[PDB]
Amino acid sequence: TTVFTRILDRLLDGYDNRLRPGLGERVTEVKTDIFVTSFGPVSDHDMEYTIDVFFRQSWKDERLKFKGPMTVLRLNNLMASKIWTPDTFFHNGKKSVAHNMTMPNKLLRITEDGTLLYTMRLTVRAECPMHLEDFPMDAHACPLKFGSYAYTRAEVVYEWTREPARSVVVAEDGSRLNQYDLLGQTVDSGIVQSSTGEYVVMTTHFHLKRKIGYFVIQTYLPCIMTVILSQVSFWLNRESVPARTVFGVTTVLTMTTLSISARNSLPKVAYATAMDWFIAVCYAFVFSALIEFATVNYFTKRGYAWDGKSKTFNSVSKIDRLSRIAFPLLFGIFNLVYWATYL
Amino acid sequence: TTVFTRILDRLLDGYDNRLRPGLGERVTEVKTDIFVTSFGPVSDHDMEYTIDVFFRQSWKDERLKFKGPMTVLRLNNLMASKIWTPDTFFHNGKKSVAHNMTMPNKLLRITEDGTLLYTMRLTVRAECPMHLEDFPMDAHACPLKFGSYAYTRAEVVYEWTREPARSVVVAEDGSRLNQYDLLGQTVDSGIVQSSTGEYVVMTTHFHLKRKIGYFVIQTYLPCIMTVILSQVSFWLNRESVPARTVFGVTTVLTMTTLSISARNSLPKVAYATAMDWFIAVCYAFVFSALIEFATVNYFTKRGYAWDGKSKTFNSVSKIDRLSRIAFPLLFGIFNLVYWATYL
Amino acid sequence: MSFVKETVDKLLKGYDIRLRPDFGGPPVCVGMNIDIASIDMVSEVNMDYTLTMYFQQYWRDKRLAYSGIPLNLTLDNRVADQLWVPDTYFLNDKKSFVHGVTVKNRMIRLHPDGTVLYGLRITTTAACMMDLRRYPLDEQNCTLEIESYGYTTDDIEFYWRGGDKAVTGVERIELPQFSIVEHRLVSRNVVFATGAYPRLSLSFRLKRNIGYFILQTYMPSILITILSWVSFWINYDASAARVALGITTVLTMTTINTHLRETLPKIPYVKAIDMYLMGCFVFVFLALLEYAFVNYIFFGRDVNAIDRWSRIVFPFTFSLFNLVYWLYYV
Amino acid sequence: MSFVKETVDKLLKGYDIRLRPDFGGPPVCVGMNIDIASIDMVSEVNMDYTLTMYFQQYWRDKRLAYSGIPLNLTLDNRVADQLWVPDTYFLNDKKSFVHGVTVKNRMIRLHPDGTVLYGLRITTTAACMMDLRRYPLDEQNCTLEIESYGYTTDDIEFYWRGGDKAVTGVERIELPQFSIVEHRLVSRNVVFATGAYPRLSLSFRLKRNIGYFILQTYMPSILITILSWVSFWINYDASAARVALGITTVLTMTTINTHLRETLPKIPYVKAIDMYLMGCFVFVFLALLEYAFVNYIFFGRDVNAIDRWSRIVFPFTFSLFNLVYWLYYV
Amino acid sequence: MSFVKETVDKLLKGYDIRLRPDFGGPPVCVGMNIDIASIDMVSEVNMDYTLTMYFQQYWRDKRLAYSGIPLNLTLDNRVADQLWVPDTYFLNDKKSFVHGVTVKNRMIRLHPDGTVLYGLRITTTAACMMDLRRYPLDEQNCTLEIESYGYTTDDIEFYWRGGDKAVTGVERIELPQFSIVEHRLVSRNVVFATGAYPRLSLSFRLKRNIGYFILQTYMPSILITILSWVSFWINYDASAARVALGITTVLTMTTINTHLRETLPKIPYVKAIDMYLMGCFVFVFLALLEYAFVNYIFFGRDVNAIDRWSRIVFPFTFSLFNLVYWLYYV
Numbered sequence A, B: 001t002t003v004f005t006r007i008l009d010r011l012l013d014g015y016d017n018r019l020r021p022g023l024g025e026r027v028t029e030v031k032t033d034i035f036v037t038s039f040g041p042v043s044d045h046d047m048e049y050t051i052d053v054f055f056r057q058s059w060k061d062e063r064l065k066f067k068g069p070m071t072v073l074r075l076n077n078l079m080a081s082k083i084w085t086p087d088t089f090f091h092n093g094k095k096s097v098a099h100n101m102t103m104p105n106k107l108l109r110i111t112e113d114g115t116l117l118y119t120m121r122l123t124v125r126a127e128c129p130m131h132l133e134d135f136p137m138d139a140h141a142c143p144l145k146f147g148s149y150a151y152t153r154a155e156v157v158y159e160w161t162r163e164p165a166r167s168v169v170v171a172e173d174g175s176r177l178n179q180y181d182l183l184g185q186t187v188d189s190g191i192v193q194s195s196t197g198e199y200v201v202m203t204t205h206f207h208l209k210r211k212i213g214y215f216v217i218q219t220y221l222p223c224i225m226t227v228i229l230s231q232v233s234f235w236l237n238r239e240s241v242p243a244r245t246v247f248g249v250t251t252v253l254t255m256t257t258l259s260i261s262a263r264n265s266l267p268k269v270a271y272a273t274a275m276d277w278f279i280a281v282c283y284a285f286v287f288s289a290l291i292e293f294a295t296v297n298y299f300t301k302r303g304y305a306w307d308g309k310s311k312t313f314n315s316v317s318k319i320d321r322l323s324r325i326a327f328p329l330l331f332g333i334f335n336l337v338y339w340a341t342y343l
Numbered sequence C, D, E: 001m002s003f004v005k006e007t008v009d010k011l012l013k014g015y016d017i018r019l020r021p022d023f024g025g026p027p028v029c030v031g032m033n034i035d036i037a038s039i040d041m042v043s044e045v046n047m048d049y050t051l052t053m054y055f056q057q058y059w060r061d062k063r064l065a066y067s068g069i070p071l072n073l074t075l076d077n078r079v080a081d082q083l084w085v086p087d088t089y090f091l092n093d094k095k096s097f098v099h100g101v102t103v104k105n106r107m108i109r110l111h112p113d114g115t116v117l118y119g120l121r122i123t124t125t126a127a128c129m130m131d132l133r134r135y136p137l138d139e140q141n142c143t144l145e146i147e148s149y150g151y152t153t154d155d156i157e158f159y160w161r162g163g164d165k166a167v168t169g170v171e172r173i174e175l176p177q178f179s180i181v182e183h184r185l186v187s188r189n190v191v192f193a194t195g196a197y198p199r200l201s202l203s204f205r206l207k208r209n210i211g212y213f214i215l216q217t218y219m220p221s222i223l224i225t226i227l228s229w230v231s232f233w234i235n236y237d238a239s240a241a242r243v244a245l246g247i248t249t250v251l252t253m254t255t256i257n258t259h260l261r262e263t264l265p266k267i268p269y270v271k272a273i274d275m276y277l278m279g280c281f282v283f284v285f286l287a288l289l290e291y292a293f294v295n296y297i298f299f300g301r302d303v304n305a306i307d308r309w310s311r312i313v314f315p316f317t318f319s320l321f322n323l324v325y326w327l328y329y330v
């Protein structure tokens, strides 16, 4: 241990951690890869997603070459803070967490050649701008961009450790998504210009597709059943005015309850989503069913119904007879057009 | 002030704050007392409570004797962290705050004899398991246990400064309870054995009694007034089928709304409480009233009511005549049995 | 590399961080520019907004001048603790922080002449007192006040670096509920009991998106109001039908108002949404109250005339209410 | 700058932050003044309010006296961690912090005679026990208690620096739900078992704005109660119409009451809002009972008299109930 | 205490925290045991549970061996920062902290042979993926994964100290909503790109309690379904009574689902609770639709047969549905 201890104390001798490797001499190349331990929940209201990663950074520092029995050293959490490391940050990050339980969730290794492997465990909240026009039948590409906050591309450049497709790895038990499926990802890199210069940006897009089953049982089925229930009024006799008025008016209140609740889960956007049109059309159908009876009642002549053993009686309305076909047919047609358009 | 300054430096001369007083020589005796500035809110959902205290600990450290013009010294918050203090913690604490605004809310006083008075202002959330079977007419004794985390009773022993009853003091304006009354307190001490050794535990129990006026006006009265309303149906004529069906059915919906909301405040416990049984009985009374009319209507013959002038007419149902007495009486009896049991 | 290391050591050797540049001399001029990364939340309930920005400060410190190195020295952000930095703060912020993953998002860049570039990535919740009389047809003006905490104008002066181009990224901002109509840069002095202080203000003008409220708030109220007029076309003798329609729409209007009213804090003054919702509530209230006169004036003592006129007056009066409302608020 | 640098280093060399000024001598007098920035929130559920202020402490320390410089040294905020400062805390403070962006919102200003001015920008959530019996027509008195933690009046004394002008910015406070009616300064000594501690108290009296509850709570309840009287003008034989009206008003009243239960706290006693809603609930309950008595007295056994009598007594008694309510609370 | 002070200072003189025990030698064996204090919360919405525990770690460090003192030296918890401790972390923990009142809830106890006892009091919110298809009749398996962040099995090895007796306090855990059925200890070596890492897993099997759901979910749904059958006993000509009964039960059923829509999570697939509510919704939908068929056959185009047969089939088929549901899920 004493022989080993001397090497460590010698390494940082005259070492300035405020200066990047090869300062004023060359560009510091950082090789990076990510292992997503759990792709956390996605929040539509906040337009953000959580992601738990093992953020691995690798680079070379000639000042940290060493010779000894071992060819790889696993440094302590304290050592990593004594040396220069890249100031990587996430461009679209909102509020990230570096885990400090029980100790700092970091690891720094050094090979004899001076190659540093540096890993940390992070929970990142990131911005994912969502265009929710096709909601809840929408797909999104949530990005994850990172780079050096302070060092321009003339000083620090980032790269992927291996092929870009094989550089972002998701754990098999990593999907922590309740309402989405992680179809895959695309890995890219580029350049971004800002007021302070040009910087290398490493980007990753996670392609997500929303699960629709929640909205079918919560929104679509009750709305469909409410529309069906509004049409069931067409099969009641025209003389039961209080019954068909209660039937139609209470179906309207059910649509209003359903329509308001569906939006409250949505973020406060100002355009019509896919679910908005379906609810609007269902609202029109239930609205038109009560207007239809208003017309039927306006032409009813006798307040009494057929007595079952025949004094004249009202005939069955021609408005009702046609509505028993037109309303189910138009709604059926609207569903084929709606579901084919978005699926 | 120079003479005073020198004494301070000499005190911590060779002082090892890693070693308790009398280590390997005797047992450190810490005398504790608590002044409750405010007994914070109690959370039935989380089964915890908040308490704001002045936590005073007193012990003797012969290493901190001194001689000078004064006989008592008040030490700044920086000095307290430089010496050895008991590693006291709260066994049932969930998340506690040691206030640090504007400065650390600590105080270390040293007497020339070597006695140290050490006070700190704390906000403590503590676990208070509750048996809610008598809810909302339930009473609880919320505990507050503390002791040394690392030192066994062979090393550190805690005692109350004065008579255990008088060692815990609650400020007159210290009651920060909305739905409870702090009846009183019992102060005890004992030994708790764990995997690491035997430890001394100081325990304080606060006896709480739930205020019922909230649930009487939010839950009990609406339930009682809805049950009365369901019985008002008995006094309508048996020929008004739509009115008595609307009357009975909407009281069922009112019971459903009341039952759902009353249990939302309650923690998700799987047993029946005193409010559940009252609501279940009110549900059965409202359900039975609508079943009563269903039986009355089955024996109704003529669809027209009494014309008001005199052709035969229905007679007042004998079921109705009896139900006008049995239902109010049975509910009245149930209330006396229910309230006398729990009050 | 050691030559650069020796240079940096010399600058901080004997460096006094408690003294501003040119202490006792002319005030140090600090220039600021901002790159706005995003505006995340704009909440009426809390009357604030969230702002993620890149915040840069420029000033000249002769103590940090260096020669012989033909490069700008970008240094590890931990060197900022060893330098004098302006005591800049956001006068109207409620809660703010500097991001710290993977490291603190802080930048220190030196220049040969002594110029210091101090950049931070900050998410700040800033107080924006909103005027909600015309809500949701309202236009807001939210500011960000940048002031020195301890130093007066005798010691430190602020200016926007680059004039009206000192703030960038505003055009790229997308808000789910607002549009950035304009932004302005102001520079002035504020006088307190302890002396005058330099102030920089950045302000935005926000116009709210009305399309969303039409589907959520206005449309359901409009349809229920039209529904309440269905009562005027039903026979006077259908008491059960007309009361059931009348009382259930009054219930529906309360339902509409309740589950919407939780979208706004307890702000006690009249707003545009309140007037429209209460205008429709009064109409459905009158449609059910209108039948009380109809039923009584037949059975208690012409009947079709009152309903016939209501079939015109109610649609007409509601259109008159809509015309006056939209013109007044647009 | 070197002269001032050595002047400051002279002061701290040999300084003992662990000892108060004039330790063992007369108590150190600390003057205090507060500049209130805003009262962000006042919550009845948690029974506390959030306050932003500039909190200033002013005392004299002979150990910090400097000569030769005819200027008041404004130093970096980090020098505050190397001096003695009072152990001031807020007694009823639940959670608080000093703002830290871009730097710690803290100020130190020295004067030649050893006088120290120490300012902090603090956001604090302070506990305020509220008496909500007259809610929403209630008037609250929320205080801030300022005390020394571990010094007695034999060591430290507090006073309001500037008399009744020691607190400014009250006119800046813009609470949407309240209006600041008055504020007071109190100086007193608090005696505990550990000794007597100097105490300063700043208290505000708040009067709640009632307009929101008139439109949101009282007016809907008044209109529903009026709507329940429409039953009195319908035929005694319209059982379905009159029961549906009466029972739906009861359901509507419960809806108002039940949804009000979530925003309001768990305060288990009768308040002003409860008495109005319970008054209106009893009136609509009795209207439903009124028809039941009419229906029973006809079919079970006059009929038109009861409706005629109810058309007058119910509106009249409700007006009397309102008159007694508003006089007793306004 | 003089001799003890020398011994303690001797151990830490030249101590290198950066190097593990037997660095570059055989792997250090770290024994662990846990004493669970409480499982505070288990939330389906956040898909996590909260666990408070006493977390002990045992390892031998010859650098910390001491002789001449026949005592086990418990030292102030702050000495832990001066010693080497394992880089242990919880792989699936979302938010966690060490309690810190009055001091850090941490323990270091040395032994003469060099054995180190290192104990912490940790409250950790750990991620637990839940399969809620059988909710509320579901059984869950939540785990806690313990791993070394940096070292490999060539450096550090984990084991449960005391075998199956390593974890204690499970039998005393009381949960308002669950019951601990079993717990297991697993030792394994997880493999990543970096290399093999030691792993210990503590897992509990939770079987949800049903009493709350019976009274809150199943019972209201059952009673409403039975109430819908009341329509079968009313005359076919009573259209206003049977439709109002039928449609209000449909409205009531949606009220249950919508109010339990906000307490339940956003997990988009068919669960056991959904099937029972959907089944009951179909039965009440069919009861209302049954009368539509009765009305059409009589008035549009025998009649008493449909009602008489409905009075048996509907109660019978609901019983059959219940039998299948409960047998399948119990």
Ligand SMILES: *[C@@H]1O[C@H](CO)[C@@H](O[C@@H]2O[C@H](CO)[C@@H](O[C@@H]3O[C@H](CO[C@H]4O[C@H](CO)[C@@H](O)[C@H](O)[C@@H]4O)[C@@H](O)[C@H](O[C@H]4O[C@H](CO)[C@@H](O)[C@H](O)[C@@H]4O)[C@@H]3O)[C@H](O)[C@H]2NC(C)=O)[C@H](O)[C@H]1NC(C)=O
Pocket: B100, B101, B102, B103, B104, C081, C098, C100, C104
């Ligand atoms: C009352 O108690 C509160 C906490 O409840 C204290 O706030 C803490 O104050 C200390 C001292 O200033 C802080 O410790 C310092 O942290 C710096 C980094 O902080 C940044 O990063 C952390 C995360 O790592 C963030 O949480 C934080 O917001 C910042 O973004 C370090 O750089 C400091 O180290 C420097 O100074 C020390 C001084 O001893 C040197 O030894 C170092 O070498 C170095 O120069 C330091 O560690 C702590 O972070 C604060 N906590 C929080 C939550 O903000 C108050 O200070 C305290 N009040 C009083 C009067 O004591």
Ligand SMILES: *[C@@H]1O[C@H](CO)[C@@H](O[C@@H]2O[C@H](CO)[C@@H](O[C@@H]3O[C@H](CO[C@H]4O[C@H](CO)[C@@H](O)[C@H](O)[C@@H]4O)[C@@H](O)[C@H](O[C@H]4O[C@H](CO)[C@@H](O)[C@H](O)[C@@H]4O)[C@@H]3O)[C@H](O)[C@H]2NC(C)=O)[C@H](O)[C@H]1NC(C)=O
Pocket: C141, C142, C143, C182, C183, C184, C186, C187, C188, C189, C201, C203, C204, C205
């Ligand atoms: C949101 O709302 C805020 C107010 O709360 C608006 O802020 C105001 O913006 C106006 C400009 O639109 C400001 O008015 C301008 O102030 C400048 C600075 O004044 C200081 O310095 C001058 C000397 O240069 C001193 O005399 C003065 O006392 C101050 O110390 C002036 O330079 C401007 O002058 C311009 O107009 C005059 C004529 O009035 C011309 O003679 C000049 O040449 C020049 O064109 C001008 O007066 C105002 O000060 C701001 N108020 C505050 C409180 O900051 C935001 O604009 C608004 N946001 C949006 C998007 O509309």
Ligand SMILES: *[C@@H]1O[C@H](CO)[C@@H](O[C@@H]2O[C@H](CO)[C@@H](O[C@@H]3O[C@H](CO[C@H]4O[C@H](CO)[C@@H](O)[C@H](O)[C@@H]4O)[C@@H](O)[C@H](O[C@H]4O[C@H](CO)[C@@H](O)[C@H](O)[C@@H]4O)[C@@H]3O)[C@H](O)[C@H]2NC(C)=O)[C@H](O)[C@H]1NC(C)=O
Pocket: D141, D142, D143, D182, D183, D184, D186, D187, D188, D189, D201, D203, D204, D205
């Ligand atoms: C919210 O509610 C709080 C109480 O909970 C109110 O605070 C009280 O305010 C009153 C004033 O309105 C205070 O009464 C005054 O106290 C002063 C301080 O008393 C201490 O110091 C004196 C010596 O100076 C000691 O004798 C005494 O024992 C205390 O230690 C007194 O100096 C004042 O005296 C003045 O009036 C008396 C007559 O009453 C005269 O004889 C005197 O000459 C002098 O003019 C006075 O007694 C009271 O102490 C406060 N209580 C607390 C607990 O702070 C807030 O005012 C209220 N908020 C609002 C907006 O109203």
Ligand SMILES: *[C@@H]1O[C@H](CO)[C@@H](O[C@@H]2O[C@H](CO)[C@@H](O[C@@H]3O[C@H](CO[C@H]4O[C@H](CO)[C@@H](O)[C@H](O)[C@@H]4O)[C@@H](O)[C@H](O[C@H]4O[C@H](CO)[C@@H](O)[C@H](O)[C@@H]4O)[C@@H]3O)[C@H](O)[C@H]2NC(C)=O)[C@H](O)[C@H]1NC(C)=O
Pocket: E141, E182, E183, E184, E186, E187, E188, E189, E201, E203, E204, E205
């Ligand atoms: C919640 O769900 C988790 C899974 O998600 C369950 O965890 C599994 O538990 C089972 C035991 O119930 C584990 O199976 C056991 O694994 C041990 C470790 O395997 C490692 O080491 C061996 C070599 O020794 C390697 O081959 C292997 O790849 C691993 O690296 C084995 O030692 C066990 O074998 C022992 O028992 C079997 C009989 O069961 C004998 O035949 C053997 O001879 C030997 O005595 C066994 O295979 C499984 O590994 C766990 N999985 C995970 C992912 O941890 C939890 O049990 C469950 N919770 C509850 C309460 O049930």
Ligand SMILES: CCCCCCCC(=O)OC[C@H](COP(=O)(O)O[C@@H]1[C@H](O)[C@H](O)[C@@H](OP(=O)(O)O)[C@H](OP(=O)(O)O)[C@H]1O)OC(=O)CCCCCCC
Pocket: A291, A292, A295, A296, A299, A300, A301, A302, A313, A314, A315, A316, A317, A318, A319, A320, A322, A326
């Ligand atoms: C939103 C739809 C608005 C439609 C508005 C439609 C407005 C409109 O034109 O109404 C008049 C009529 C009403 O039809 P309906 O059959 O209900 O009314 C019959 C009609 O009035 C006959 O003339 C009456 O016989 P008579 O000669 O008096 O002896 C008969 O009396 P009775 O013998 O039964 O007692 C009435 O019942 O409807 C149509 O012609 C459209 C049918 C297709 C409508 C298709 C709609 C899609």
Ligand SMILES: CCCCCCCC(=O)OC[C@H](COP(=O)(O)O[C@@H]1[C@H](O)[C@H](O)[C@@H](OP(=O)(O)O)[C@H](OP(=O)(O)O)[C@H]1O)OC(=O)CCCCCCC
Pocket: B292, B295, B296, B299, B300, B301, B313, B314, B315, B316, B317, B318, B319, B320, B322, B323, B326
């Ligand atoms: C839960 C209830 C279960 C009830 C189960 C079923 C209980 C049961 O048997 O009900 C029917 C019976 C009579 O019911 P009810 O009086 O309402 O019905 C009258 C009865 O049918 C007469 O026989 C009829 O006269 P008639 O002779 O035909 O000319 C009369 O017609 P009309 O003269 O008006 O034209 C009908 O109105 O009620 C009891 O015995 C109540 C016992 C106490 C019940 C106490 C219940 C608490």
Ligand SMILES: *[C@@H]1O[C@H](CO)[C@@H](O[C@@H]2O[C@H](CO)[C@@H](O)[C@H](O)[C@H]2NC(C)=O)[C@H](O)[C@H]1NC(C)=O
Pocket: E070, E071, E072, E111
């Ligand atoms: C220091 O701790 C060790 C370990 O707990 C103690 O050794 C125990 O001694 C008791 C004596 O009755 C035995 O029954 C146990 O089996 C021992 N444990 C082990 C792991 O060997 C030791 O006694 C402690 N030292 C002192 C002075 O109490």
